[PDB]
Amino acid sequence: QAQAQNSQYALARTFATQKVSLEESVLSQVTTAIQTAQEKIVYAGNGTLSDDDRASLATDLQGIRDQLMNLANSTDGNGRYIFAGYKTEAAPFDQATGGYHGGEKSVTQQVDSARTMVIGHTGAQIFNSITSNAVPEPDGSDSEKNLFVMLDTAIAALK
Amino acid sequence: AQVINTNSLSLLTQNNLNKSQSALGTAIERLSSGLRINSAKDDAAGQAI
Amino acid sequence: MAQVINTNSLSLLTQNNLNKSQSALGTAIERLSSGLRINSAKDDAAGQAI
Amino acid sequence: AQVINTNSLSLLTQNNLNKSQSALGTAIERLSSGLRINSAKDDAAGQAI
Amino acid sequence: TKDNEWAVYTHDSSDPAATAPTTASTTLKFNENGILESGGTVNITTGTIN
Amino acid sequence: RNGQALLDLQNSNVVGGNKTFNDAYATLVSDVGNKTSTLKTSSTTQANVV
Amino acid sequence: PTRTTVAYVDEAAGNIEIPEKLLNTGSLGGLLTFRSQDLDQTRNTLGQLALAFADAFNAQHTKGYDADGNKGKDFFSIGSPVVYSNSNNADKTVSLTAKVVDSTKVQATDYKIVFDGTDWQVTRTADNTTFTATKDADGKLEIDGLKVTVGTGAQKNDSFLLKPVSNAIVDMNVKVTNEAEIAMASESKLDPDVDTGDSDN
Amino acid sequence: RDQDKQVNIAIGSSVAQINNYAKQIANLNDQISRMTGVGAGASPNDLLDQRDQLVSELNKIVGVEVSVQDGGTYNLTMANGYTLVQGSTARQLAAVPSSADPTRTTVAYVDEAAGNIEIPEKLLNTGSLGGLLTFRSQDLDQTRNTLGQLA
Amino acid sequence: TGAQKNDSFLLKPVSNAIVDMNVKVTNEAEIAMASESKLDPDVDTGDSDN
Amino acid sequence: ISTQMMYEQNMSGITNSQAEWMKLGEQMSTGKRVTNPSDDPIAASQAVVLS
Amino acid sequence: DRALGQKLQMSNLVDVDWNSVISSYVMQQAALQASYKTFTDMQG
Amino acid sequence: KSSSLSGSLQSFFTSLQTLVSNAEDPAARQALIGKAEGLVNQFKTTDQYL
Amino acid sequence: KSSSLSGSLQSFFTSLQTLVSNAEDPAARQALIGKAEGLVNQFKTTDQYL
């Protein structure tokens, strides 16, 4: 019984690793994307552009926005949407509204007799939350949470 | 595995080599041309301006 | 101390050490190729963020 | 009676040996020439293109 | 088709005149634990040849 | 565009209504695995008995 | 009434039963006591094991939903207890139906139950512990993990034997040919305001 | 498809074999009867063990039941069904293409005065005959039809 | 004093300390760092109070 | 009894241990845990999904 | 990179361990060698 | 040990752990009910021997 | 010597050091939680083995 139980925990641990590793690379690309987004917005701030240059920059922001949204909707090596929570069978977001459609519960699994571990970071955690080290809005209005709302609003303002 | 077939480490190193190659080619291309910008890939907005 | 797992113990205990060593070897070769200490999400959790 | 070796293994291995040799010959050809396509069907569409 | 009770039929395979009807030769009965209760006696007859 | 339509089918759950082609093949694989495993086991167990 | 047993003949009274405790000599006695004490005890132990499994399984299995979205369909079939009358009792038509409520308290033993004239005595035939029949609060028998119905026209010394686990394995089988049935999710695939997707484990 | 066609041949040969053994056992019953009748206590130790040996071999051919009778004769049953051999009397069997699917082979037994009732693949599925039959019917057909289906 | 004369009792203090023990915190905002308060006028802590 | 019993026990042991020897030979020559779906079928199913 | 990860996953899926199987093979074949000899005398 | 009921239960719960990790796997669900049938096979063979 | 209370506890305090350097940081704040739980894991597992 003991040896079998150790094997069982070994398999559960295997699968936790399996998910987390792939999530790592997708998130790496996510962070690079938003970094270049920040940089582009700095240039959006420059006030010596020709208005069509601002529109061009809007087109580049649109490219970046599309890339981010592509990353968000990604699946795993079984076709399961990784960022869906439990709803791994369906596309979790909408490229129009920026809405989130997955289950806002993370996925759970136990790997050893004590460590019960979470391996699925349902999208709302990642793209619709700000951590309490929150750069606040200077006017008292609620701080934005939806990355896509931010970038779409900026694209509209530029265009 | 079974007779170190399809070794991971070699493939990993090959990928890192790919990245180094790309960086090298970019640098030589810019240094040779005399421009920081040679295609829309360099600076999309700057190209237009 | 009867063992088919002895005259076998000897062996595995060797295989385990080889596994540990080769894991370290892979880490070293990967880093030395990449030119970075931080490659995964687990070279440095805090370092990733900073 | 199924156990009969009949050099099951020897044949077994050999099969795999010639398969590895097939792969090795592909590799050596590509290595010496520099080409990825030599037969008609290393890749037919890419060959035409 | 009735737990503790069965219906039983008989035939003579050599005398074709013993054609079995749907009428059971006898019904058999069982007590509160499955032990024979009643019903198991009958006399059977066939034609005779040569 | 119709070519894209054909490609799209590769993901679709048509066969089982909830199962696609590929997972249906995987289902066939698991069915054979289940049987062969259970029957191997039972065969050897009864073999020990005899 | 399901056994063979060794009896001696009296002058004209016929056949008499004697305890295997009396006939425990050489081969015969070895056979009887092996089959009764060793073999039936192991039978009842394996029966208790099988009992709880399928049952304690189904009981927890009911809680979840399955891949079609319904409340999952419970897994195992299992053999039901059998109770026996003893021939010398008054009536030969009162079969005491068995009554199961708790598979975590079954005990792997035969039970002898007797109606003593004002109440009942119960015993576990391996431990042979004697105790007056615990009842439900409604006039019927209770024993640990099993419960039993009671007759009416009982003899003074009406003596029953209960087998709560022995028949368990004989019918036990998988009732689920279809993979969709398994109660995997904790919530429905089809409830209006909760989610389980395909992955809720 | 060819693996179905292969099993049909063995089914036929095995039915021929069950017919072969049944007669041997009948002659053994009769010859034991006569030998022990003349013996007046002399017991043909070899032949009795021959009876049991042939029984056991035939038992492997198919699901078989055995029992002894008054005098010393045997009864043999297709346990799922009925008793075919009693006294020195043994019945017959034949190999037939099934009524529902004449493309596949199945066994027909005869209660000689009653008829050669075809037994399709249902009851036979234990013993080497059954070993062939349940494989071909449950395993092979389900496989072929699932390949054909998702397809 | 429900105990009778020389009735005995047994404390095994840490026999289940580890088994019971669990974590009670998940949020980044949860951890206590400042040496005094932050929601009051008579102190200087800021957020970076370590 | 004991003579035929000895020979049969010996052959049982040899046959089994031999059958072991062939399995590991197959695994080594192939380079794999599995080729047959009775080796580890679940692995093969998740393998087709991965493919 | 996604392909690299997938290929690694497959690799661990299909293969066991290098040293484990070679070692167990060698030992067990030694034991088989011994079993042969045991029978060889047993027939006496 | 082919008769080891433990072995069968261990295999069944291996199936269960693998399904628990991936609730979707048709293979694991189907194999789990298969291992249940093998478990009852062990049970039945032991019981019939007794 | 890898799996030991010493190693996990050393790591926990090292994480706390990186935190005391950066009271504000949410990432460091969270990373501390994980190792804090890992101590729970080690304690539970060891005691349970006893």
Short mmCIF file of C-alpha atoms in Angstrom, two decimals, chain L residues 9-43:
data_model
loop_
_atom_site.label_atom_id
_atom_site.label_comp_id
_atom_site.label_asym_id
_atom_site.label_seq_id
_atom_site.Cartn_x
_atom_site.Cartn_y
_atom_site.Cartn_z
CA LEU L 9 -7.35 -2.35 -5.66
CA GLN L 10 -4.03 -0.53 -6.03
CA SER L 11 -4.38 -0.71 -9.81
CA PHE L 12 -7.95 0.57 -9.61
CA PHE L 13 -6.93 3.56 -7.52
CA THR L 14 -4.02 4.25 -9.85
CA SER L 15 -6.71 4.59 -12.50
CA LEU L 16 -8.68 6.82 -10.14
CA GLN L 17 -5.71 9.10 -9.40
CA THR L 18 -4.98 9.44 -13.12
CA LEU L 19 -8.63 10.28 -13.83
CA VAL L 20 -8.67 12.71 -10.89
CA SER L 21 -5.77 14.58 -12.46
CA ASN L 22 -7.50 14.65 -15.87
CA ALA L 23 -11.26 14.45 -15.39
CA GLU L 24 -11.63 14.59 -19.18
CA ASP L 25 -9.69 11.48 -20.18
CA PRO L 26 -12.15 9.00 -21.73
CA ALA L 27 -9.36 6.44 -21.49
CA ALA L 28 -8.97 6.76 -17.73
CA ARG L 29 -12.71 6.59 -17.02
CA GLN L 30 -13.20 3.56 -19.25
CA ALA L 31 -10.10 1.90 -17.79
CA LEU L 32 -11.31 2.64 -14.26
CA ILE L 33 -14.53 0.74 -14.80
CA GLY L 34 -12.40 -1.97 -16.42
CA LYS L 35 -10.25 -2.19 -13.31
CA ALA L 36 -13.41 -2.37 -11.23
CA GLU L 37 -14.40 -5.41 -13.28
CA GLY L 38 -10.95 -6.94 -12.77
CA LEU L 39 -11.27 -6.26 -9.04
CA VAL L 40 -14.56 -8.12 -8.89
CA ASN L 41 -12.89 -10.81 -10.98
CA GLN L 42 -10.32 -11.27 -8.22
CA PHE L 43 -13.12 -11.26 -5.65
#
